[PDB]
């Protein structure tokens, strides 16, 4: 009855951005201002809809994607963006209808010696299409020389670590991100605000 947004936002561990997480929200009531009115989010930006009145609209589905990225990459989580994350890891469509929420997670996801658990895709042959996901681990080949599964001059494992350390500058600190996709179908509306 109450959308399980708490399990999305309050999860102990978040996914690497290349292996970003998705949860489908359906048949529930969403208390959106339990999220909008909180000063705990350094980013709360909505597209195609207003942050206001969010509790008065209804959608066929709501998808809650979440992942960890660098502080200065949060700007890439928006329609019309380019860069390592927008191009190679998580891509929003030009006509995105939803809200992007992010908060600093240095105290949870950083580690003395660098966190090795959070990764990103550094190389890709083509850009992701909106909401595409690539968890492949084939060695990336630059130039004409084949790699044959070994790194070298022109061959690099495509995933690399943020290595979050607590002393990093904020631009290089980890940020947890939640993307809410509001899906409007010609079908029964199943996710509804309280009013």
């Amino acid at each position, epitope marked *: 009855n109450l959308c399980p947004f708490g399990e999305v936002f309050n999860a102990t561990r978040f996914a690497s951005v290349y292996a970003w997480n998705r949860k489908r929200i359906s048949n529930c009531v969403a208390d959106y201002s339990v999220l909008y009115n909180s000063a705990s989010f350094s980013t709360f930006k909505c597209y195609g809809v207003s942050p206001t009145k969010l509790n008065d609209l209804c959608f066929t589905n709501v998808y809650a994607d979440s992942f960890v990225i660098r502080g*200065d990459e949060v700007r890439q989580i928006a329609p019309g963006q*380019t*860069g*390592k994350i927008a*191009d190679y890891n998580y891509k929003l469509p030009d006509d995105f209808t939803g809200c992007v929420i992010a908060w600093n997670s240095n105290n949870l996801d950083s580690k003395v010696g660098g966190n090795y658990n959070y990764l990103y895709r*550094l*190389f890709r*042959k*083509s850009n992701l299409k909106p909401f595409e996901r690539d968890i492949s681990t084939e060695i990336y080949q*630059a*130039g*004409s*020389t084949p790699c044959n599964g070994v790194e*070298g*001059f*022109n061959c*690099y494992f495509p995933l*690399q670590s943020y290595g979050f350390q607590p002393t990093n500058g904020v*631009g290089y600190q980890p940020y947890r991100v939640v993307v809410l996709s509001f899906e409007l179908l010609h079908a029964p509306a199943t996710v509804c605000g309280p009013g």
Partner: antibody
Amino acid sequence: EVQLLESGGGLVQPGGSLRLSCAASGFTFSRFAMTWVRQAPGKGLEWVSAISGSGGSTYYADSVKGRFTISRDNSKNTLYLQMNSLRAEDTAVYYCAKVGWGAFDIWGQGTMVTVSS
Amino acid sequence: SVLTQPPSASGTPGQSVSISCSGTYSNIGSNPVNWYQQVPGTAPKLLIYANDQRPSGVPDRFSGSKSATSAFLAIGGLQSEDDADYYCSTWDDSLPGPLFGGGTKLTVLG
């Protein structure tokens, strides 16, 4: 900490041969590929040759394939470029560089090689 | 097989500038892009790798971008000490080693 110090540049006659060396320090030399890049006076940069961390694989640009031979001595942390059948077009400053994530992330100061009558 | 850069670029102190690098689908379109800064006489220095990534010690006013077949180096807050030749560089599916653009001389107008 990291440093690439090149040596051996000089004047050489057309058709002659010359060898350059690049001494490395401040990082585990054997774990990284290395490359040579050159720049003719007033011209842009041109990739010349590269070698695997172990030396088992070598790469050459067509402009030098057959005449130049790249090598390394991981026990002495040194990289070499043996140049043969030198022509006046090979005149340039020659740079040694470390390879990392598709780029050349650490360069040496360069050495001048003049092939002239 | 060739990467094309404008031979020159300029901007007034503190302003921004964007240096372009024009290629083809076989190089810029399919391979990571690097940018180098060379104060003439000194060795090139890596500014950008993998299209838009900065080595440690490179300030964030240097930023890289890429489109289908072209790459761009944006430089904010221009200082006179930014006067240098800037080189783009990428790989080509047909070649064993990377390519370099012809270079762009940046002048911070005085």
